Structure 1
């Protein structure tokens, strides 16, 4: 229905706005672009599903997210991948892990404040109907 297509357009507007606000934060710069496989060829041999904020933006636009739960699965991957690939005690690794955790915490706090639970419930009921 046009009502349902209006619902998903509003979801995509909301997801673009959250993602833009994560992407412009100086702490999250390293998560805005894919890991360069030339300059880091080991990444793909040890991380199963790479994710970054530029790939989240592409997926919003290709209509890959039909719920906020689906979007948060990708934000969680950005964080868990950073923790996996940079596990050591050196300051370079500790700083990346601190910034990865702050990304996930910031995304969850925006959504907690700004997402209406009835709007997410409607997205879920339309998704389960298809």
Structure 2
């Protein structure tokens, strides 16, 4: 149908916007602490601590599969990255400190993406 197509073009454009957003959020992690999943070979007990792991590569895979339907779903995953890190790592670690900085610096990027998605529909 012509309706299914028009939906597919909206999803494609949402995907293109969320790709730019992702690139901006990941520039706020210059040390690449959150680039890849936590290694289960190097942290064998990780899944006893964190039930829903997340990272930027895993978000990227989902994005390119057009698996995000709206900005809320994308933000959920971003927030997992941050919140997992702040539980698993103690306050006085380079990891916890990096998540805090990502959270604070990402809030500005997310604040404008919420308006661009409402705006462009």
Give me the TM-score of the superposition, normalised by structure 2.
0.84
> Structure 1 unaligned runs (5+)?
123-130
Worse-matched range after superposition: 103-112 or 19-28: 19-28
In the alignment, what sits opposite 1:16? 19
Counterparts in 2 of 1:104 and 1:24: CA distance versus 1, 3 Å: same
Could you tell me which of 64, 81, 84 is aligned with 1:81? 84
Give the 3-state SS of the residue equivalent to 1:31 in structure 2. coil
Q: Contact 1:28–1:103 (CA<8 Å) still a contact in 2?
A: no
In the alignment, what sits opposite 1:69? 72
What are the within-5 Å matches in structure 2 for residues 36-75 of structure 1? 36-75=39-78
Residue 45 of structure 1 and its aligned partner are, at CA, apart by: 1.3
In the alignment, what sits opposite 2:38? 35
- Find the aligned partners of 2:18 and 2:100 in 1 and give their Cα distance: 19
Superposed CA deviations along residues 26-70 of structure 1, whole A, max 9, x for unmatched, are 545110011111011011111001000000000111222110011
1:109 aligns with 2:112: no
> How many residues are paired up?
116
Between structures 1 and 2, the one with greater helix share: 1
Q: Deviating runs (4+, > 6 A) in structure 1?
A: none
> Structure 2 unaligned runs (5+)?
none
Give the 3-state SS of the residue equivalent to 1:35 in structure 2. coil
- Find the aligned partners of 2:119 and 2:14 in 1 and give their Cα distance: 12
Give me the TM-score of the superposition, normalised by structure 1.
0.78
